[PDB]
Design an enzyme around this catalytic site. Structure first.
Site, short mmCIF file in Angstrom:
data_model
loop_
_atom_site.label_atom_id
_atom_site.label_comp_id
_atom_site.label_asym_id
_atom_site.label_seq_id
_atom_site.Cartn_x
_atom_site.Cartn_y
_atom_site.Cartn_z
N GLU C 31 0.86 -1.16 0.00
CA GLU C 31 0.00 0.00 0.00
C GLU C 31 0.91 1.23 0.00
O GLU C 31 1.51 1.52 1.03
CB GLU C 31 -0.85 -0.21 1.25
CG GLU C 31 -1.97 0.80 1.48
CD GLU C 31 -1.54 2.15 2.02
OE1 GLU C 31 -0.58 2.33 2.81
OE2 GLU C 31 -2.28 3.09 1.67
N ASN C 42 10.75 28.57 -9.15
CA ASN C 42 9.90 29.74 -9.20
C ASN C 42 10.79 30.98 -9.23
O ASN C 42 11.64 31.12 -8.35
CB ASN C 42 8.92 29.74 -8.04
CG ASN C 42 8.10 30.99 -7.99
OD1 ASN C 42 7.26 31.21 -8.87
ND2 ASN C 42 8.31 31.81 -6.98
N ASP C 44 9.90 35.19 -9.53
CA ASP C 44 8.96 36.30 -9.65
C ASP C 44 7.51 35.81 -9.74
O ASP C 44 6.73 36.31 -10.55
CB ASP C 44 9.34 37.25 -10.79
CG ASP C 44 10.76 37.78 -10.76
OD1 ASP C 44 11.15 38.47 -9.79
OD2 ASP C 44 11.49 37.49 -11.73
N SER C 46 4.19 32.91 -7.69
CA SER C 46 3.68 32.14 -6.57
C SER C 46 3.14 30.80 -7.05
O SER C 46 2.11 30.75 -7.71
CB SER C 46 2.62 32.94 -5.81
OG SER C 46 1.47 33.17 -6.62
N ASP C 48 1.59 27.11 -5.96
CA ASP C 48 0.96 26.17 -5.03
C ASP C 48 1.01 24.76 -5.61
O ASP C 48 0.77 24.58 -6.79
CB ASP C 48 -0.46 26.58 -4.69
CG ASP C 48 -1.14 25.67 -3.67
OD1 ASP C 48 -1.69 24.64 -4.10
OD2 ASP C 48 -1.08 25.99 -2.46
N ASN C 55 -11.34 22.85 -0.33
CA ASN C 55 -11.85 24.10 0.21
C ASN C 55 -13.35 23.92 0.43
O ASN C 55 -14.14 23.95 -0.52
CB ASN C 55 -11.47 25.30 -0.66
CG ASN C 55 -10.05 25.77 -0.43
OD1 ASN C 55 -9.20 24.99 0.01
ND2 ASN C 55 -9.77 27.03 -0.74
N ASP C 97 -20.61 -13.24 15.98
CA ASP C 97 -20.32 -14.63 16.34
C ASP C 97 -19.63 -15.33 15.17
O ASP C 97 -19.46 -14.74 14.11
CB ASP C 97 -21.61 -15.35 16.73
CG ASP C 97 -21.48 -16.63 17.56
OD1 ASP C 97 -20.35 -16.97 17.99
OD2 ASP C 97 -22.53 -17.28 17.79
#
Lengths: 125, 125, 125, 125, 125, 125
Positions: C31, C42, C44, C46, C48, C55, C97
């Site tokens: 697994e 990166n 200049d 941003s 993610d 969200n 059982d």
């Protein structure tokens, strides 16, 4: 004339800033998580790094319930966990019995990491 | 004349900033998750990195229920987990019995990581 | 005249900023999830990065239910999980059982990662 | 009946992190340069600030001239300067004479920063 | 009955992080340059600021001239300058004479920054 | 009955991060350049700012001229300058004379920044 030899060189792994387990013959339960590896070079900026990021300004609370009877609340139980056997139950009566509900019992192992043999049967001079 | 040999060179893995398990003969339960590997070079900027990001300003709460009877609430249970055996139950009566509900029981192993043989049966001079 | 040999060179894997498991003879439950690999450059800006991004400003809560009887609420259970055996049940009476509900029981293994043989039966001088 | 007054309130300038000269009646040569004003807020970065930036790995040098006669070299003279009167000359003979080449001579000033008058000529009781 | 007054309120300029000269009656030579005003807010980055930026890896040099006669070299003279009167000349003979070449001579000033008058000629009781 | 007054309120300029000269009655030579005004908000990036940017890897040099006679070289003279009067000349003989070549000579000024008058000639009781 009867001449013979045996030879064996070994050398372990080389690890550089890393996670490494070479050769594991005959393991049973193994569990690795979050053994993370990263290089970060930041100039003139802001780097965040994280596998699990939970921004939850109201997570698993309960609300206002005046005059309430016979409650059974169990939020955020067994979170990020292993091997929780018949545990953390929200009940009023519990009966448990028998020869059941067994975890990881009664194993038999016969395990060799490496073998070398040199069979010589008769040179007789 | 009777001449013979055996030879064996070995060398382990080379790992550079990485996750590595070479050769695992005869494993049973194996569980790896989130063993992440990253290089980040940021100049003049902002880098975020994350596998699980949950922005949930109201996650798994309960609401206001005045004058309420015989509740059974269980939010966010067994989250990101392994091996939760007959566990974290929301009940009032529990009866358990028998020779059942068995996890990972009674194994038999015969396991060799490497083998080398050199059979010589009769050179008789 | 009777002359013979055996030879064997081995070398493990080379990993560079990566996830790698070479050769696993005779595994059972395996697994892996979220063992991610990334380079980010990166300038200049941003960046993610994330596999799971949820969200959810109201996720799996409950609402206001005054004067309510015999509730059974179970939000966001067994989330991102493995091996949840007869677990996290929302009931009032439980009876279990028997010789049933068995997980991963009673295996038999005979497993060799590598084999080399050199059979010589009679050179008799 | 004969009643009279004079009144005058004054208050100077308010300066906040600034360059300021209020009221200069009747000036002659005035010379301001590079009286710079700046606010800098730097977070997680690198700010350079400069009016004159000259990156010149070979600026105003001279080269190799073996066996040379009657040279007249004058690099980077009167740089960023004021009032250089018949100066820094590259010659061999200089003759200067006369009633000429005059700088800022023979001025006449009659200058009042502020005036207030109150003329009353005859109330005679 | 004879009643009279005079009144005058004054207040100087308000300057905030700025260059300011209020009221200059009757100036002569005025020279302002590069009196710069800036706000910089930098987050996660690199800001350069400059009015004059000269990247010149070979600016105003001279080259290799072996066996050379009667040279007149004058690079980068009077750079960023004011009031250079008959100056920095590359010659061999200079003759200067006369009642000429005059700078800023023989001025006459009659200059009032502010005036207030109150003339009353005859109330005679 | 004879009643009279005079009144005058004044307040200077308000400057915010700016260049400002209010009211200059009766100026002569005025020279402003490069008195720049800027706001910069940089997030996650690189801002360059400049009025004059000269990238010139070979600007105004001279080349290799062996065995050369009677040279007159004058690169990059009077650069970004004011008031260069009969200056920085590349010659061998200079003769200057006379009642000529005059700069800014013999001015006459009669200059009032503000005037207020109140004339009253005869109320005689």
């Amino acid at each position: 004339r009867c001449e013979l030899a045996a030879a064996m060189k070994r050398h372990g792994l080389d690890n550089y800033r890393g996670y490494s387990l070479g050769n594991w013959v005959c393991a049973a339960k193994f569990e690795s998580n979050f053994n993370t590896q990263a290089t970060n070079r930041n100039t003139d900026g802001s780097t965040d790094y994280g596998i699990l990021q939970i921004n939850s300004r109201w997570w698993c609370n309960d609300g206002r319930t005046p005059g309430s009877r016979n409650l059974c609340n169990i939020p955020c139980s067994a979170l990020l966990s292993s091997d929780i056997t018949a545990s953390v139950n929200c009940a009023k009566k519990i009966v448990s019995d028998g020869n059941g509900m067994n975890a990881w019992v009664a194993w038999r192992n016969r395990c060799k990491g490496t073998d070398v043999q040199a069979w010589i049967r008769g040179c007789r001079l």
